[PDB]
Amino acid sequence: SINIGLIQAREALMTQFRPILNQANITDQQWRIIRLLAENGTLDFQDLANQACILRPSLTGILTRLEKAGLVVRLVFLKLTAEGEKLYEEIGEEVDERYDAIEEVLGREKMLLLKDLLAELAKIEDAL
Amino acid sequence: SKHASINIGLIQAREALMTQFRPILNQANITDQQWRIIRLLAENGTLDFQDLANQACILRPSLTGILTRLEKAGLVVRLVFLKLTAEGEKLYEEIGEEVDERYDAIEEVLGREKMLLLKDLLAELAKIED
């Protein structure tokens, strides 16, 4: 029920977001990594894997491409490059415009509630 | 930036939920997608191929292959409509009982009422497909 509702909600969101990702030729997972490194200051490999919800064997390859593309750099801690910061703001702007279009219909109040409930649900491992 | 990520928020919520369900599904030879099909076939009784694909969010070629496996195991049968077998009904009730036990554990923490609201809000967010 909730499992399925989650996938149905994100899938409907993803179909309209996928054309955007192809214009920068970045994948979903790459975008999550890019955004997380921006919304956080810096993140190590394990923490990045946990928050991006990417398996450790998969994350290494993805990170390598982002560094070859000069978007992410290793120092083990990871952080966006100057260019990575710019890419995040441009794509993020389109997403905010997308967020605004949904909030205009769904309702600002319902939208805020959805954010809180999704955040609490993610946190329920430590709380169990 | 301005507003939080819905993309990331959605996937983080589900991963934490799947973490509580994977040990149950792995003790049986069931995958996430297979379980999704089994529940949908149970809540509707019977579903045709296209309708099943849309609700389980599984691509038609992939759905076909999974269905072939579920029939080899004698859990699903074609009639084009799909339905659980008698044993399929048994597996759903058996696995479902273990799954329900985890929902109760989560709801004790998240809140029984809030859990219900989240389903509604996700459906509304989902219906604004456009």
Author numbering:
A (entry chain D): 9 to 83, 92 to 144
B (entry chain C): 5 to 83, 92 to 142
Lines quoted from the article behind this entry:
NadR belongs to the MarR (Multiple Antibiotic Resistance Regulator) family, a group of ligand-responsive transcriptional regulators ubiquitous in bacteria and archaea. NadR binds the nadA promoter and represses gene transcription. In the presence of 4-hydroxyphenylacetate (4-HPA), a catabolite present in human saliva both under physiological conditions and during bacterial infection, the binding of NadR to the nadA promoter is attenuated and nadA expression is induced. Each NadR monomer consists of six α-helices and two short β-strands, with helices α1, α5, and α6 forming the dimer interface.
However, it was eventually possible to crystallize apo-NadR, and the structure was determined at 2.7 Å resolution by MR methods using the NadR/4-HPA complex as the search model. The apo-NadR crystal structure contained two homodimers in the asymmetric unit (chains A+B and chains C+D). Upon overall structural superposition, these dimers revealed a few minor differences in the α6 helix (a major component of the dimer interface) and the helices α4-α5 (the DNA binding region), and an rmsd of 1.55Å. In the apo-NadR crystals, the two homodimers were related by a rotation of ~90°; the observed association of the two dimers was presumably merely an effect of crystal packing, since the interface between the two homodimers is small (< 550 Å2 of buried surface area), and is not predicted to be physiologically relevant by the PISA software. Subsequently, analyses of the pockets in apo-NadR revealed that in the absence of ligand the long Arg43 side chain was always in the open ‘outward’ position compatible with binding to the 4-HPA carboxylate group. The ‘outward’ position of Arg43 generated an open apo-form pocket with volume approximately 380Å3. In summary, compared to ligand-stabilized holo-NadR, apo-NadR displayed an intrinsic flexibility focused in the DNA-binding region. This was also evident in the greater disorder (i.e. less well-defined electron density) in the β1-β2 loops of the apo dimers (density for 16 residues per dimer was missing) compared to the holo dimer (density for only 3 residues was missing). In holo-NadR, the distance separating the two DNA-binding α4 helices was 32 Å, while in apo-NadR it was 29 Å for homodimer AB, and 34 Å for homodimer CD. Assuming the same DNA-binding mechanism is used by OhrR and NadR, the apo-homodimer AB seems ideally pre-configured for DNA binding, while 4-HPA appeared to stabilize holo-NadR in a conformation poorly suited for DNA binding. Overall, these analyses suggest that the apo-NadR dimer has a pre-existing equilibrium that samples a variety of conformations, some of which are compatible with DNA binding.
